Enzyme design. Structure first.
Site, PDB file in Angstrom:
ATOM      1  N   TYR A   1      28.009  39.000  36.673  1.00 57.14           N
ATOM      2  CA  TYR A   1      27.120  36.984  36.097  1.00 57.14           C
ATOM      3  C   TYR A   1      25.877  37.731  36.525  1.00 57.14           C
ATOM      4  O   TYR A   1      25.028  38.498  37.082  1.00 57.14           O
ATOM      5  CB  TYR A   1      28.042  36.601  36.769  1.00 57.14           C
ATOM      6  CG  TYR A   1      28.946  35.869  36.116  1.00 57.14           C
ATOM      7  CD1 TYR A   1      29.517  35.485  35.189  1.00 57.14           C
ATOM      8  CD2 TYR A   1      30.610  36.330  37.049  1.00 57.14           C
ATOM      9  CE1 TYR A   1      30.664  35.130  34.323  1.00 57.14           C
ATOM     10  CE2 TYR A   1      31.483  36.369  35.777  1.00 57.14           C
ATOM     11  CZ  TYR A   1      31.256  35.859  34.629  1.00 57.14           C
ATOM     12  OH  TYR A   1      32.460  35.616  33.889  1.00 57.14           O
TER      13      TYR A   1
ATOM     14  N   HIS B   1      28.833  33.726  44.681  1.00 54.61           N
ATOM     15  CA  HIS B   1      29.058  34.800  43.695  1.00 54.61           C
ATOM     16  C   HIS B   1      27.625  35.814  43.152  1.00 54.61           C
ATOM     17  O   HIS B   1      27.340  35.475  42.086  1.00 54.61           O
ATOM     18  CB  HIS B   1      29.670  33.413  42.624  1.00 54.61           C
ATOM     19  CG  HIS B   1      30.476  34.490  41.527  1.00 54.61           C
ATOM     20  ND1 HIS B   1      30.481  35.860  40.965  1.00 54.61           N
ATOM     21  CD2 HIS B   1      31.849  34.192  40.042  1.00 54.61           C
ATOM     22  CE1 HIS B   1      31.389  36.669  40.237  1.00 54.61           C
ATOM     23  NE2 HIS B   1      31.866  34.732  39.271  1.00 54.61           N
TER      24      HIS B   1
ATOM     25  N   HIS C   1      30.702  40.346  39.206  1.00 59.94           N
ATOM     26  CA  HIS C   1      31.579  40.306  37.879  1.00 59.94           C
ATOM     27  C   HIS C   1      29.928  40.325  37.001  1.00 59.94           C
ATOM     28  O   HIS C   1      30.786  39.788  36.165  1.00 59.94           O
ATOM     29  CB  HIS C   1      32.596  39.159  37.551  1.00 59.94           C
ATOM     30  CG  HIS C   1      33.521  39.776  38.489  1.00 59.94           C
ATOM     31  ND1 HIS C   1      33.583  38.496  39.376  1.00 59.94           N
ATOM     32  CD2 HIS C   1      34.458  41.019  39.077  1.00 59.94           C
ATOM     33  CE1 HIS C   1      34.956  38.857  40.135  1.00 59.94           C
ATOM     34  NE2 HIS C   1      35.830  40.247  40.438  1.00 59.94           N
TER      35      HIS C   1
HETATM   36  C1  LIG Z   1      42.018  33.698  35.926  1.00 61.65           C
HETATM   37  C2  LIG Z   1      40.728  34.601  36.704  1.00 61.65           C
HETATM   38  C3  LIG Z   1      39.931  33.706  37.034  1.00 61.65           C
HETATM   39  C4  LIG Z   1      38.740  33.913  37.594  1.00 61.65           C
HETATM   40  N1  LIG Z   1      37.876  33.526  38.014  1.00 61.65           N
HETATM   41  C5  LIG Z   1      36.725  34.385  39.130  1.00 61.65           C
HETATM   42  C6  LIG Z   1      35.876  33.192  39.697  1.00 61.65           C
HETATM   43  O1  LIG Z   1      35.695  31.926  39.186  1.00 61.65           O
HETATM   44  N2  LIG Z   1      34.731  34.175  40.395  1.00 61.65           N
HETATM   45  C7  LIG Z   1      35.060  35.099  40.680  1.00 61.65           C
HETATM   46  O2  LIG Z   1      33.972  35.831  41.854  1.00 61.65           O
HETATM   47  N3  LIG Z   1      35.880  35.903  41.297  1.00 61.65           N
HETATM   48  C8  LIG Z   1      36.730  35.101  39.685  1.00 61.65           C
HETATM   49  N4  LIG Z   1      38.463  36.754  39.256  1.00 61.65           N
HETATM   50  C9  LIG Z   1      38.686  37.697  39.776  1.00 61.65           C
HETATM   51  C10 LIG Z   1      39.735  37.154  41.173  1.00 61.65           C
HETATM   52  O3  LIG Z   1      38.628  36.384  42.204  1.00 61.65           O
HETATM   53  C11 LIG Z   1      39.657  38.188  42.026  1.00 61.65           C
HETATM   54  O4  LIG Z   1      38.440  39.198  42.407  1.00 61.65           O
HETATM   55  C12 LIG Z   1      40.439  39.420  41.503  1.00 61.65           C
HETATM   56  O5  LIG Z   1      41.683  38.766  40.709  1.00 61.65           O
HETATM   57  C13 LIG Z   1      40.802  40.173  42.242  1.00 61.65           C
HETATM   58  O6  LIG Z   1      42.414  40.840  41.587  1.00 61.65           O
HETATM   59  P1  LIG Z   1      44.333  40.865  42.214  1.00 61.65           P
HETATM   60  O7  LIG Z   1      44.113  39.545  40.965  1.00 61.65           O
HETATM   61  O8  LIG Z   1      44.520  41.799  42.481  1.00 61.65           O
HETATM   62  O9  LIG Z   1      43.700  39.872  43.292  1.00 61.65           O
HETATM   63  C14 LIG Z   1      39.510  35.127  38.320  1.00 61.65           C
HETATM   64  C15 LIG Z   1      40.593  36.353  38.278  1.00 61.65           C
HETATM   65  C16 LIG Z   1      41.512  35.400  36.994  1.00 61.65           C
HETATM   66  C17 LIG Z   1      42.753  36.672  36.982  1.00 61.65           C
END
Ligand SMILES: Cc1cc2nc3c(=O)[nH]c(=O)nc-3n(C[C@H](O)[C@H](O)[C@H](O)COP(=O)(O)O)c2cc1C
Ligand SMILES: NC(=O)C1=CN([C@@H]2O[C@H](COP(=O)(O)OP(=O)(O)OC[C@H]3O[C@@H](n4cnc5c(N)ncnc54)[C@H](OP(=O)(O)O)[C@@H]3O)[C@@H](O)[C@H]2O)CCC1
Ligand SMILES: Cc1cc2nc3c(=O)[nH]c(=O)nc-3n(C[C@H](O)[C@H](O)[C@H](O)COP(=O)(O)O)c2cc1C
Lengths: 375, 376
Positions: free
Chosen positions: A181, A176, A179
């Site tokens: 982090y 990861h 975002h």
């Molecule tokens: C509730 C939630 C939790 C997420 N947790 C992670 C995460 O733990 N690690 C990560 O890399 N992205 C996380 N994401 C981002 C998603 O992996 C993804 O990149 C993003 O939702 C892409 O958008 P999409 O919903 O249009 O497919 C999260 C998104 C949501 C809505």
């Protein structure tokens, strides 16, 4: 339908290209994987489909959310093993996302209430609030900037957690690095103000993610390592002055790692902001043809190997992505929350359930987690 | 019965259905002069008892940030607009002219003597956004000039004169474009307004400008000929606010007070919805879900004493649910109306809709991508 043509992701023969994006859900009570996670991933697993787990702790200091899983203790490995076994019984491939939040934490999530660690002492501004264990939203505190040795120990935390994932039976891990982090806090020049070997130039700001990826590549093999980045997402004050520049520099480092190691990474996974509704404004779509707007395609063109695109994709958009060569795989986040059989729905072009933000990070093993209905 | 086609009394205007042409910059008004092509375009879309809101129309030489947008600040512009209004009224439609000042969302190429665009602030829009230049390239917004209270009053006067001009041209009324990060929104949003005088800081100070604009036009042409358009939760051109609901409610209270003081109701309040949807983030002043978005919209509607128009991503299904549930009295459609001249009829019959071509949204051709979209 190009989404349902097979694709060989290194050693893994996938039957379709719809990927479960990693998604923190906070059902892992006490940072221990629970049986409910097994039910959640089993619902979404398909024969030959690829799943990526919610972000998973690599050390006691890596958490910034309540009740997220770890994989740094053998206890956690044992519980993950039961979840992996159930997903594998459905014929799916599953990678464990290794997640360190860096400064995006709070004293309540840190051992002995210690300060969270980062590339810098700058805190996330008050433009952002952290979800608290009681349900309120707190203020991001001032983090501790870590020295070169602690950086090596964090790298070792990544290495040991990749080994723990293999020990749990995971087919691979995902780094990861998106975002805002910890890894993104070293990548992004809007955060990394270091003057040592990890800061300044593009090259120096890429050293952390290079060290992390090489460490896990050496430990478990390149073909069991995916890398996720978001050069164009400014989450948690993580903006770069030139996301094109930074994306290409990451791509260069991944290519050199693959060349030095003689093997390809499992994939590069790039996620982007969702601009679906910018079409309804006067100027929302102006600039869409600039090179910086075409970042996803630029990085794909420069990268040797498997490319997973992410962010705002639909059935129609994902089909178009695969047929135009923009990506080999398309990961879906929010749609997979509310559609356990999203793969079947995309195949049938069936209607899609709506998702409920209120239940994204609650602790209920059923409500808003496994009780979204199938077709 | 489709609730979109139950009639509605919007003040003195009797509408037959609730499908509205949203105001849509299209850049066919060559040299800022309404051209015959606008006449054909608006005629194609007019229906018996339907409501049309025109593209943003300049109120002054400084108010443009797109090429070939019409003005309504000259008598020549009034004369050319009159021919378009006549053609629309021939078909029994109601039409309002949207009065539009872009503020800092401009460029020296659009300003007299290449002067700096005017705004509440000296902060430019970020490099996350672009401007359409006359040659069709996408350019960078420059540094604006922050105007003093006297210049503010002159801008208010521009609105007032342009409102009188629109009625002279035969328009049924005007709409105040106070949304999407443009001049008025540059005063409203505390993500833009960094002033320290009586037009900045507090909510009430930040609502001063729109209050005076609306009061001026109301007093000039009557409240029932004034619509007001705002967008409290929006990314567009950095127009964020720390508390969009409270900002929205404060605007609503000013509008309610203008109505009570003048003894009459505005034509309507027009609210556009956010240009984003959350993805589990937690940012100050961002709506966290479609549910939070929907409650914001209905809260503003419930607080406002009069007609409510909603806009932004609406479809046939979402428009019906909006009126059915009482969330809005009217629903304005933009992009679908670009490509479907008979969008109203298509919505009535649940017919297929034409795709639209974003490429020709802002070109200057009087036909291609403007009036050559086919009827059913
Ligand atoms: C509730 C939630 C939790 C997420 N947790 C992670 C995460 O733990 N690690 C990560 O890399 N992205 C996380 N994401 C981002 C998603 O992996 C993804 O990149 C993003 O939702 C892409 O958008 P999409 O919903 O249009 O497919 C999260 C998104 C949501 C809505
Ligand atoms: N019979 C039909 O198919 C009709 C579709 N309609 C619309 O007309 C257009 C038709 O053209 P198309 O079928 O080739 O789809 P396209 O315009 O290429 O883009 C599809 C979606 O991706 C969206 N999209 C575009 N660009 C971006 C971007 N950079 N970033 C994120 N999102 C984006 C885009 O929004 P805008 O078109 O910009 O308003 C749209 O919602 C589409 O916008 C489509 O939604 C009207 C109703 C009938
Ligand atoms: C090409 C285009 C031009 C627009 N011009 C204006 C405008 O001049 N004034 C305004 O208030 N809104 C303008 N808008 C926003 C629309 O009025 C409307 O709110 C928007 O299209 C959202 O609805 P939709 O999904 O039906 O397209 C414009 C939108 C588009 C796509």
């Amino acid at each position: 339908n190009p989404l349902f043509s097979p694709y060989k992701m290194g050693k893994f023969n996938l039957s379709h290209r719809v990927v479960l994006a990693p998604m923190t859900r906070c059902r892992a009570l006490n940072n221990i994987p629970q049986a409910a996670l097994g039910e959640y991933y089993e619902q979404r697993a398909t024969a030959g489909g690829f799943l990526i787990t919610e972000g998973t702790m690599i050390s006691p200091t890596s958490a910034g959310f309540p009740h997220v899983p770890g994989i740094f203790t053998k206890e956690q490995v044992r519980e993950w093993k039961k979840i992996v076994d159930v997903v594998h019984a459905k014929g799916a491939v599953i990678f464990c996302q290794l997640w360190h939040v860096g400064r995006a934490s709070h004293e309540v999530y840190q051992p002995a209430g210690a300060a969270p660690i980062s590339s810098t002492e700058k805190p996330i501004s008050n433009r952002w609030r952290i979800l608290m264990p009681d349900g309120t939203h707190g203020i991001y505190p001032k983090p501790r900037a870590i020295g070169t040795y602690e950086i090596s120990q964090v790298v070792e935390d990544y290495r040991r957690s990749a080994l723990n994932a293999i020990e749990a039976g995971f087919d691979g891990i995902e780094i990861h690095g998106a975002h805002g982090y910890l890894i993104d806090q070293f990548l992004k020049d809007g955060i990394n103000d270091r003057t040592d070997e990890y800061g300044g130039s593009l090259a120096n700001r890429c050293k952390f993610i290079t060290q992390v990826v090489q460490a896990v590549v050496s430990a478990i093999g390149a073909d069991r390592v995916g890398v996720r980045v978001s050069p164009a997402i400014d989450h948690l004050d993580a903006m770069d002055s030139n996301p094109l520049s930074l994306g290409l520099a990451v791509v260069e480092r991944l290519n050199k790692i693959q060349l030095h190691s003689g093997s390809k990474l499992a994939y590069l996974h790039v996620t982007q902001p969702d601009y679906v509704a910018y079409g309804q404004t006067e100027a929302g779509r102006l600039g869409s043809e600039e090179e910086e707007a075409r970042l996803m395609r630029t990085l794909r063109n420069a990268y040797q190997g498997t490319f997973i695109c992410s962010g705002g994709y639909t059935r129609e958009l994902g089909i178009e992505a695969v047929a135009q060569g923009d990506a080999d795989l398309v990961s879906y986040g929010r749609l997979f929350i509310s559609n356990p059989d999203l793969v079947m729905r995309i195949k049938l072009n069936a209607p899609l359930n709506k998702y409920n933000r209120k239940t994204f990070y609650t602790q209920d093993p059923v409500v808003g987690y496994t009780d979204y209905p199938f077709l």
